[PDB]
């Protein structure tokens, strides 16, 4: 699911410079960049089944937090309840 979320974030956001994995980006990576971190998978009952938790950690150049708030609203708009296709898994 990393590939799908990364592709969606890159395609639908243009302020973004890159969407990496947890410990990938070097100190010279160009901000703002995002990091997709997968969490637990927990059995949340019969109706939901196993529920994965995924975090999207946005980063910014320490200019001001308003830019990061705008980026956060953009990410929420992109990923919230929109069906995403992971081309690697084809799922």
């Amino acid at each position: 699911m990393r590939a799908g979320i990364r592709k969606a974030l890159i395609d639908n956001i243009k302020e973004l410079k890159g969407c990496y994995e947890p410990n990938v980006p070097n100190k010279d990576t160009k901000k703002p960049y995002m990091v997709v971190v997968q969490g637990q998978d927990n059995d949340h009952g019969e109706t939901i089944g196993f529920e994965r938790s995924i975090e999207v950690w946005i980063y910014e150049g320490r200019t001001t937090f308003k830019k990061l708030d705008k980026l956060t609203k953009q990410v929420v708009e992109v990923l919230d309840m929109n069906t995403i296709v992971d081309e690697s898994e084809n799922e």
Partner: protein, 124 residues
């Protein structure tokens, strides 16, 4: 000690093994309770030398990974007024990883500046 002695010594020592360096300064300016960064670029002649036998730290985490070492010093003349603070930074691209000026020691004689002793951090 006379000012001319210090000036001659600093210039000689820099000229034994000088390197042309492109310092880039990012100065944070307080605007509406946040920082607006103005980037300027300044060049100086510089000699780089070892000062401390230190070990390379590594700081890998979910934000990213980078390793830095504090071994290298620096020695620059009076040609440009430097300054480093929490809100002010200075870096330059040595070909073996980007350098960063951590702390500045302004060599002063009788209240007159003559050159900056300096310390670096080679950010890999």
């Amino acid at each position: 000690i006379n000012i001319d002695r210090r000036r001659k010594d600093i210039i000689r020592t820099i000229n034994i093994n000088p390197t042309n360096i492109t310092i880039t300064s990012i100065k944070k300016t307080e605007i509406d309770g946040a920082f607006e960064e103005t980037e300027t670029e300044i060049k100086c002649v510089v000699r780089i030398f070892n000062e401390k036998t230190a070990e390379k730290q590594i700081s890998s985490e979910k934000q990213g990974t980078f390793s830095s070492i504090r071994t290298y010093g620096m020695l620059v003349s009076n040609d440009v007024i430097l300054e480093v603070n929490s809100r002010d930074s200075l870096e330059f691209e040595c070909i073996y990883g980007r350098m960063k000026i951590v702390n500045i020691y302004p060599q002063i004689v009788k209240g007159e500046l003559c050159g900056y002793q300096c310390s670096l951090e080679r950010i890999d």
